[PDB]
Every structure is written in structure tokens, then in C-alpha cells.
Amino acid sequence: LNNLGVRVSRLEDRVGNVKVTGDARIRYQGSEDKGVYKANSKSLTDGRARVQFNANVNDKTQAVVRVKGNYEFGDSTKGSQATIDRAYVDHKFGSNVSAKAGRFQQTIGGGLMYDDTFDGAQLNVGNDKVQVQGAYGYMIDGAADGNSKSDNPSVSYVGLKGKVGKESSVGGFYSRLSSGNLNHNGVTVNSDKQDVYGFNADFRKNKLWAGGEWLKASNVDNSQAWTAGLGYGNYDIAKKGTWDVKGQYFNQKANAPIVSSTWDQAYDLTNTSNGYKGYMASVDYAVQDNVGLSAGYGFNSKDQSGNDLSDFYRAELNYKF
Amino acid sequence: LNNLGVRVSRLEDRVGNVKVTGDARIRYQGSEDKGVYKANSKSLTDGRARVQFNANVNDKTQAVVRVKGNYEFGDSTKGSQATIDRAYVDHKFGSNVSAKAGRFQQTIGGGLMYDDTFDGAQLNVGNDKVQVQGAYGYMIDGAADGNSKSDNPSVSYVGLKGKVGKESSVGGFYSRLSSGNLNHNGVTVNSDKQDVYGFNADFRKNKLWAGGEWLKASNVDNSQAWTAGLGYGNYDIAKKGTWDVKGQYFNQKANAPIVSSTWDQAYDLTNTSNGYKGYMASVDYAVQDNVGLSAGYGFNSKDQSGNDLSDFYRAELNYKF
Amino acid sequence: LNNLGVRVSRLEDRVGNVKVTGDARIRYQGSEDKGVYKANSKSLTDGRARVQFNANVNDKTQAVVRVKGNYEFGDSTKGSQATIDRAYVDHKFGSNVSAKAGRFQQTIGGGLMYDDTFDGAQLNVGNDKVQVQGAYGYMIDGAADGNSKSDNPSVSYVGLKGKVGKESSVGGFYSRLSSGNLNHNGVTVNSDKQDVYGFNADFRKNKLWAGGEWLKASNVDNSQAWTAGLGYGNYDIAKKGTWDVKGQYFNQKANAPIVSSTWDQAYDLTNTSNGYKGYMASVDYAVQDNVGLSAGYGFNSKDQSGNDLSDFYRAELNYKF
């Protein structure tokens, strides 16, 4: 028993404050019309490998550094360059107040508008039912990609979230964006300030999910965007046999601010100049522990004027380390 | 005893599923003529640092992510880029069948044609006496570098390996390459379908080794290539004092497909227009545990028409950690 | 207990020779005149994340591989590319002789002339009170950035460091630079050989600190550069509540070689065409364990001819993993 203890103690020397996690993904995307996912083609098979380091700076602060690498199956034009996707420090100023600083992931509202990289600061105040999240910074991925410091609109976001029921939650959000460059239909246009505001709901009872979100720019005409979805399943990547099915509908207008949505819709501000309106059915199945298989079929895609867009379909495998 | 276990649990809370290995290399290469290794010069001293993360997704699957960085001693034009060299998932479908998916390392035959990065899928059926390996994908390195997905020649490879006696192994392979752009003597030229079939043998007894390989494209004339080598030693980088010496003759014709050979000759389809034929003597010595000094000298280098080529020589330090 | 013993051994299987450390910095720099820190702007808010893998090749050798990623808050033109900052091997040939090989950090003398990346070899002979350091290689960062191998000036450095008390140490250094391209005021000018020689001294009685450094090129005229500073504090980033204040003065002539100094003056060989002469006050405070807030204000900046220069000021937060 004593010797074993010593053999434990030596391990305590080698292990540090950094825990290494990560994930891998092999994805296939396709559409009935060329150009939706890859230029001058109607298919795209790619892969991604992310390695994350969670470091315990001390007992009240932690940092996260994520290194990602994307590649296409057969694309040898350039090497799979490694990029720092996440680099931020998280502080716990008590049992309620929390803070984040650096390049982290921000979700503007319910994720329909933005659920991706964010350069700036974030604050969180709330115990168990009411949570106020306040972020200040700049968007990175999505239609806000390719902009410089002077040309990148600054987001001031405040979001209220309330826990109604056991695992159901409602909420709202109010964001203000300064004038800056945004990617509309493949061209960078300098847009004025916007006052986006929105509401969302997510009711989940015993393997039945019903979610919805509606956002609108206060000072921009025909700029609202909403989504509504239902689903059944108990998906969890860490347990075998856990599946999930869901069907949702997206109706977003021409001027609706959709930089990089959380959902796997193929049409957003970057792709469409006259809105998007259509359904999408997604299926997930944990084939093994920490190995999940996802499929998705987006159909009935149309513009806001009835013009018929192109369908799309995805199939991906995600491995969690 | 309960406390000790708690300690172990804390270690299991921090160690995770990712094991970090890696290696480093300090290499010098030279030749008697300019342009063999570095443009407009006859020497190249460089270094490489690779860090590999091996993650146990579950009992029957693991993933590998390798971050590689090359640099040249004194070259400060660009920072040492970090590139995702390997990113793949390995599945064990029982005691015999195994599968690989993603960006891995493929060895087409004995390694003379290609032993390097590969984007696609691999399926191994093993019996500890006879092994079958089938790969479908794209070459990423060597003469296949600089190609897009629409120009990269797809490879469909099937290889058999028979373990004759103990530690000795023979084998063969048949591969089909689709039409695509290949780098012939620095010029990207489009080539039609090719059928590369070959055999190899590797007889190791006591401390002596004798190997050979022969491959040929069925529908292309003047594409036959082969190598034959003899060596003596017991090299193992993790064991100090283990040495090794070998001498091998390479004879590859003008149109022989040699994308990225597993050996260290400096002439493979990318810097030759009329073939290669010559000897190469290599020496290895584990100076310390996990440290190895390798040297090589390639001489009698000639084209297939009798015209002389440039001799070359290498000296490298490999640190394994 | 046998069940526990199997677990602990498993940990030793999943814990290799690589220990992962790192740091994360969030920095703000600014000046009263545009262009000191960023083009056409008098401010720069950036962040950096470094992850270092310290390996143990064996009991007498150890390698280091550092992956560094910089970004600017709001700059989305390019991803935060990961660069291999350090990649080298450290050998320990007894209790008095040590060596390094690869891309490491070199401090030429006291660091006023250069303390940054270095490609080459280093040898150390130390009597535990008198140390001799000899480095042969190339500069990679600072005014030597953007140079190829054929243009990078080779550096042959021999430095001596003696201890004259409990903490106070004096020393000197002699370095030889070959002909090469160096960045003077944004223009890459070719310069002949230089024979830099210099001295430095440091005294750390109690918490007081008094440091100084002088250096000059033997053949070039108007190349003398010196710094002298005082301070009081016990700054240790791993201890909460440890503060530090200091104030120093720099006097750098027009042709004084300041490639990448170890101090934080905003003016060096890359920014100054007629030298620099001014004061700088720095403050450090470890607000938390492994967290530190640093501030700096450089004022009275002037050319060697009396022409006024801009005043600079910075504030940063450093977290050690």
C-alpha cells in the first residue's frame, strides 16, 4: 500500500494543469445545384481535427487554447494549416459572476444569428433561473469574416435567459452592431448600425423537444428571421444507442442579420440575396461511445419571393476524445 | 485506502484520453551539384518538430492528430508553420478486421512507389500469417503535391503480405491510378489511368537483412522500377549502442511512378526526366536512448542513358519522445 | 487493492514523457503618434496563446516544442495561424557542460541587443558561479525578420557571466556578425561584418534592483547603446500580492544594433533612423496566483539630435498555465 502510494506521487510530478481533449469530424455535404458548398461543384467531402488544452491557472481561473486543422479529401494544394480557434481566459468571481476574455465562442441569442468565434469580453450574472450574459467585442466567423479591425462591426450584446419548468427555458436578447463591412451574397458592403432584438423558447419534456426563435433588426425594413422546430430523442454522444430525430423550419428575410447560425442550414447572409425559407430534417445516432453519426436533409428551400432554391444534404461522423 | 483511490480519481480527472508523443529531427543534406535539395545551392540544413496526440475514443476506436513544423536553419522569411500532418480515426472491428479513415500514412507496396500522407479510407484483414490491405483515396505528398481535388489522381490499392518463416515477409500489390496531374520534372503534366503492379521481399535472419522490390505500370512503357539492398545490424532507437549498416541499389526508369519513396534517394519523378540508377550506403547508430544518428551516401548516380548525375549525402539526428 | 494497482499502472501508460505547459497574454499598446505599434493607428489590443511541450528523451536529454498563436482583437482577415516558436533539443553532458540545438531563445549579453528566437547551436560551461556561453547561428526575430538564409547575418557569440554576491552578477560578451541584410527604419540594408562587444551588471540586494548594460560595435561609428535602471519589488507571478516598480533610461545611437531587445521600449533598429533616448517606468502586480497585471509608460523619447519622439504606454495581463 505504501509503495503504491509512492508510485502515485511520482505521477503527480509529471501531470500538470493542462488537460488535453479534442474531437475529429469527417463530413460530406451535397446539393442539387453547384456552388452551395463548394465552388463549381455540388459536393464537398472534408475533415476536421481539433485539439483543446484546458489549463487550470488557479482554483478560480482557467484558460482554453484550441488548435484546429481542416482539410479536404484529396486537396493537396496547401497543407492543413493549424489555426488557434479558441484562446481565452475564464474567471469565476464568486458563485454567480463569471467572466471571459479573449477569443472565445459567443452565441447571440438562441444561435440563429451567431454561435461562433468572438474577440472581446463576456460577463455572466445569474444563479439558477435568471441569467444575464453581456458581451462586447467583434465577430470573426461567418459573414463577418475577412474584415479588419477598422472594418469589423462591434457587437454590444445583452441576453436574458429564464428557466421555466424543469429543463425548459425561455429568453430574449438585445444586440447593437456598429457600422461596418458585412458579406452580402459574396460582396462586402458597408452597413450602418443595427439594433437587433429577439426572443427564443426551448421546451423539453421527456424526450420531446419544441424550440423556436424570432429576431428582428429594429431600424431595418424586412429584416426579421425566425425558426421553429420539433424533435424526439435522447441523443448523447457518450452513450451507445442514443438517437434523435428532429424537423425544423427556417424563414429568414433578405436583410435579416444571420452571420453564422448555430443550425446546419446552408443558406444565410453570405449565400442569399433574397432571403431563405425552407425545412430541414436532422437525425443523430451514437453508433458507439463517443462516436456519433449525423445526417441532415434540407428541402423546400425558397427565396422570399417564391423563387425555388436548391436542396442540400449532409452526413458526418464526430469522434469525441 | 479510500483516500489513495480518490487521488487516483483526481489523476483520472486530469490525465484524460490523450497521450502526447512526438519527435524532432536536425538534418543536413548535400550534393555535389546545385538544385538537388535546395534551389540554387548544394546544401540544406533544416529541422522538424512533430507532436502527436493519440486519443482513445473508446475501447474499439482511437484517433491520431499530428502537428508538424519544419524550418530551415537561418531562414526567417516566414514563421515555422504548424501543419496537421495526420488526422485520422482507427477502428478495430474484431481480432482481424481494422479500418482507418481520414488523413493517414499509406505505404503502397514496399514503400518504393509511395509511403507518405494519404487522404481516404483503408481496410486491413489480418491473420498473423497473411495480411490483406485495401485503400481508396488520394495522394497528398511527393509528386502529387500542388494538385486540387479535381486533379489529384485517385488511388485504389490492394496489397497482400505473406509472413514466410519468422521475421521474413514477402508480398505484392496491385494499384489503379485515375487520370490526374502529376509532377514530372517540375512540370505538372496530366496523365491517364495507370495500373501499377509489384512485388517485394524482405528476408531478415539473425542480424542480417536482404530486401528487394519490383514495380511496373502495366499500360506504360519504360515504367519498370526496382531496388535491391543488403544490410547488417540491430538498430533500435530506444536502445543505446545499437548500430546498423546497409547498401542498396536503385534502378528506376524514366516513366516509373515514384511519388514519395520510403527510401532516401534524392531522385524520384520530380527532379529527373530520364530515370535514375545508382547505389546508396546508409548507416545508423543509437548514440543515446531514444536518440539516433543516421548517415547516408548515394553514389554512382546515373540516368538510364548513361549520363552521370550528382552524388548526395545526408546526416541527421533523430530524437524520439 | 489489486483493482487499484491496475488503475495506477494504466495512468503510467497514458502519461508519456511530454509535459504540457504554456501561457496566455492579453496586451494593449498605444502611443501619442500614429504608426508606432500599428500602421495608421495609435493603438493595438492583441492576444497571444502559447502551448509548450517539454519532453524527456532520456535521463540526460530533453526537447522543447512550443506552438504560439497571436491575434488582434477584432482582426478577422486571417485566422490566428499557429507557428512553431521553439523547437530544440537540450543535452546535459555532466554537471558543467550543457548544449542546445535547434530553434531556441538566445539572449546576446544582457538582452539589450537581442533576446529572441535563434536558429543554431549553443554550448554552456558552468562552474556554478562562473558561466561561459557560446552560440553559433542566425537571428530569426526583430530587425532580422524577413531574411533568407543567404541574407541572414550569422552570429558567433561568446559571453561570460560571473557572480559577485548573493544575487548580484556582472558579465560581458563579444559577438561577431557577418555581412547580411538588416532592417533599418523599414528598409532592408546590406551591412558588412560587425564586432559587437559589451558589458552588463545587475545588483539585487534585498528587494532593491539596480541594473545596467552597455554595448558597442568595434568597427562601426556611432553604435554605442546603453541602458540603466533602478527598481524595487519582489514580483513573482506565482505568488498573489507580489508587486514591483521600476524605472530605466535608454540611450541608443543611430547605428546601434538593437534587433529584438529584452526590454519593452517601442524604438529599436526597426523604428529609429536617428537613435532613441528616453525613460520608461514599469509596474507589475500579481493580482492572482499565476496571473499578473503589468503596465508601462515610456516618456521623454527623443532622437540623438534632440528631435522629439512619441510617448508610448502598454498594459497587459499574463496567465501562466
Residue numbers in the entry:
A (entry chain B), B (entry chain A), C (entry chain C): 100 to 420
Report text from the authors:
Reconstructions up to 3.2 Å without enforced symmetry revealed a trimeric arrangement of the protomers. We term this periplasmic region of VpOmpM1 the ‘stalk’. Only the region of the stalk proximal to the OM was resolved well enough for model building, as the cryo-EM density deteriorates towards the SLH domain end of the stalk. Measurements of the blurry SLH domain density observed in 2D class averages suggest that the distal part of the stalk spans 50–60 Å. In reconstructions without enforced symmetry, the α-helices forming the coiled-coil are not equivalent in either dataset, as they exit the OM plane in different orientations. In the E. coli VpOmpM1 structure, the sidechain of R113 in one protomer interacts with the sidechain of N155 (part of the periplasmic end of the β2 strand) of another protomer.
Most diderm phyla from the Terrabacteria group have recently been shown to lack well-characterised OM attachment systems, but instead have OmpM, which could represent an ancestral tethering system in bacteria. OmpM consists of an N-terminal periplasmic S-layer homology (SLH) domain connected via a linker region to a C-terminal OM β-barrel.
